[PDB]
Swiss-Prot record:
Keywords: Cytoplasm
Signals that turn on the gene: By calcium shortage, copper deficiency (via MAC1) and the presence of galactose (via GAL4).
Cellular location(s): Cytoplasm
Cited function: Functions in the galactose metabolic pathway via the GAL83 protein and that it may control the level of ENO1.
Native source organism of the sequence: Saccharomyces cerevisiae (strain ATCC 204508 / S288c)
Highest taxon listed in the record's lineage: Eukaryota
Cellular component annotations (GO), alphabetically ordered: cytoplasm
Protein name: Regulation of enolase protein 1
Length: 185
């Protein structure tokens, strides 16, 4: 199922398509977070979701121009506003961080300094039998694990590009090299 068959949640004011690619500029005050610690909920982030069956593997290339605190881009898997995962690069603390947030009612955020090129990376996500696995790659050859966690079973998921700027907008990101299939095995 091709990238252009996705549906937007919070379509950005500025976005254009090329064959197999989506290029967007984020709007201000866009974020995804539920409750934990900060005591607010946000469901305003940009998400282009492609609908899946009950299990899938998805992969995408992410080329963002990060420049400010909290700038984020990557991939999201979503069931609804209370059950989702986002993963990718985020600017937090001192550096470009590889970050993931698994939300099941409430958000669970993990982060670490990213050792690759923040401006060009791939993500691969697999959901099957109530387990989500996230892998990242700097070369499309080797795919280290980022996260392995329970995730609710569902007849369908939405999966696809995500990007957020919780403060000032203007983050430019291109998504390409999309693939969505059943998991191996």
């Amino acid at each position: 199922t091709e990238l252009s068959q996705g549906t937007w949640l919070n379509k950005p004011k500025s976005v254009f398509q090329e064959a197999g690619k989506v290029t967007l500029e984020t709007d201000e005050k866009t974020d995804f977070w539920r409750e934990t610690f900060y005591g607010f909920t946000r469901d305003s982030g940009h998400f282009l979701g492609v609908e899946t069956g009950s299990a899938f593997t998805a992969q995408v290339r992410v080329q963002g121009s990060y420049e400010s605190l909290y700038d984020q881009a990557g991939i999201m898997v979503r069931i609804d506003d209370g059950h989702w995962l986002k993963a990718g690069i985020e600017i937090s603390d001192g550096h470009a961080m590889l970050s993931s947030v698994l939300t099941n009612g409430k958000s669970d955020w993990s982060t670490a300094v990213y050792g690759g090129n923040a401006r060009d990376f791939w993500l691969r996500v697999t959901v099957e039998k109530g387990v989500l696995r996230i892998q990242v790659s700097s070369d499309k050859k080797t795919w280290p694990l980022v996260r392995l966690a329970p995730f609710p079973t569902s007849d369908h998921y939405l999966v696809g590009p995500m990007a957020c700027t919780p403060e000032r907008g203007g983050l430019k990101v291109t998504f390409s090299e999309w693939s969505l299939t059943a998991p191996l095995g």
